[PDB]
Amino acid sequence: MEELNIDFDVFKKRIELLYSKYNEFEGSPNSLLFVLGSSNAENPYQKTTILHNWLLSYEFPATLIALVPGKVIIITSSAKAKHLQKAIDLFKDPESKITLELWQRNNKEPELNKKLFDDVIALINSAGKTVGIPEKDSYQGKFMTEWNPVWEAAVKENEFNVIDISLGLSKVWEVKDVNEQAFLSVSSKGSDKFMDLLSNEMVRAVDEELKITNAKLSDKIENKIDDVKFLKQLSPDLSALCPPNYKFNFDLLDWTYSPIIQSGKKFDLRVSARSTNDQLYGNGCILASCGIRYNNYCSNITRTFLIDPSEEMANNYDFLLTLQKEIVTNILKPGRTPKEVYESVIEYIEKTKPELVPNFTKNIGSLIGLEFRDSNFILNVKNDYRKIQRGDCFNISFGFNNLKDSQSANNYALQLADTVQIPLDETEPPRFLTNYTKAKSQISFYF
């Protein structure tokens, strides 16, 4: 029986990175503490889950991880400890200042579990009074019900200074190493392939005047991820982009979020957007967003399709393209804050199409990676506390909403998103990881 596939050298590298950084997080925690209950596929981007994905490339439910000076402690099931066991010997070599311990808990014995919880809490206390945790994280289940009161009691008794480490974590894993950059490329290639399918399906549905809602059409695209025939078609392209020594594996392909299709006269350009249960409207502007996730690495692509567009629709789409090229080539530079980047975008728009400024989205996207949307790295005027770094990957996403076509008086919107990697190398321009066509001639259809 084959064990779970985990890269322990990467685990060791990343644990040692975290350890080299965490005392310098805001508020200087003596210890880090991560507790993960039951998994939820419908809320997959909590910091503790992201930590598991970054460390092990798998989420481990019902598992505690603590970092204290000189020690990582993992409390988990006997089956889960079996996945991890070989990692013990790796930390023994004279280089590392850290040992790894795996403490085996059991679903069916609350007294063993409580005692293990007691023991880890005592070690944390021995390290000091400041305990760093992802404060926003919420998990359910039996493990959590055993943990929560034991932790609550400890904070009081030990007078722990419990602090949020969400910003520190975002910073530790922000810059993508070469393998992550490759997994992002794979993710993005997937997105291109599903967008191609989407455009092909949308056209046929419009041409044939199907009875079908935006939501049913986007559900049809979503469900193709379960179609091995379709998966086999895109295999060569995605496998070609996997890093050496990390073989393409279909098991590792998922959705970042449910695909979005929008049509009609009312549009939503914010992350809150969901396909509506209205009939697909085969005229004007159609907005589609896809984001495949490969090996936990998120991507994003948004395209506008123009059906029998008016001149103003087409002309504003040309500008949308010009703006994207300006943002990526000239504005999105290492060393700049999100606020500086966003202000520079408004400046450019005010100089070229000032009338479009009130219609512009309030951000131009965000840092992307293991987390779809890092809320400490949204590209808007509010963020003046991060600098862009070489190695950062972004979802660059923006649009113009509530545009009125003059001769029809019809409302419309335009939207464009790609996933863009900033190379580690300074001589290298940003790379588009998503390369599905955005040329006006290729996204325009006439019926």
Residues that bind Cl ion (CB under 5 A): 270-271, 362-363, 380
Q: What is the CA radius of gyration of the chain?
A: 24
Provide, rounded to whole angstroms, the least separation between the CB of residue 395 and Cl ion.
10
Provide, rounded to whole angstroms, the least separation between the CB of residue 273 and Cl ion.
8
As a whole number of angstroms, the distance between CA 288 and CA 276 comes to: 12
Provide, rounded to whole angstroms, the least separation between the CB of residue 382 and Cl ion.
7
* Residue 181 in tokens: 């950059």
* Residue 413 in tokens: 């919107």
Select 29 or 338, whichever has its Cβ closest to Cl ion. 338
Local structure of residue 378 (DSSP, 8 states): B
Select 261 or 378, whichever has its Cβ closest to Cl ion. 378
The phi-psi region of residue 227 (left if phi > 0; otherwise alpha if psi is between -120 and 50; otherwise beta) is beta
Q: Could you give the angle at which helices 178-207 and 214-223 cross, rounded to 10 degrees?
A: 130
Q: What are phi and psi of 35, to 5 degrees?
A: -125, 125
Q: Max CA-CA distance within the chain?
A: 76
Select 166 or 363, whichever has its Cβ closest to Cl ion. 363
Select 175 or 271, whichever has its Cβ closest to Cl ion. 271
Provide, rounded to whole angstroms, the least separation between the CB of residue 1 and Cl ion.
45
Local structure of 219: helix, strand or coil = helix
Nearest residue to 414 via CA among 324, 341, 343: 324
Provide, rounded to whole angstroms, the least separation between the CB of residue 269 and Cl ion.
7
* Residue 239 in tokens: 């496998």
Q: Which residues are paired to 391 by β-bridges?
A: none
Select 397 or 421, whichever has its Cβ closest to Cl ion. 397
Query: How many degrees, rounded to 5, is the angle at CA 81 between CA 34 and CA 182?
Result: 70
Provide, rounded to whole angstroms, the least separation between the CB of residue 383 and Cl ion.
9
Select 163 or 356, whichever has its Cβ closest to Cl ion. 356
Q: How far is CA 336 from the centre of its chain?
A: 21
Select 30 or 366, whichever has its Cβ closest to Cl ion. 366
Provide, rounded to whole angstroms, the least separation between the CB of residue 18 and Cl ion.
29
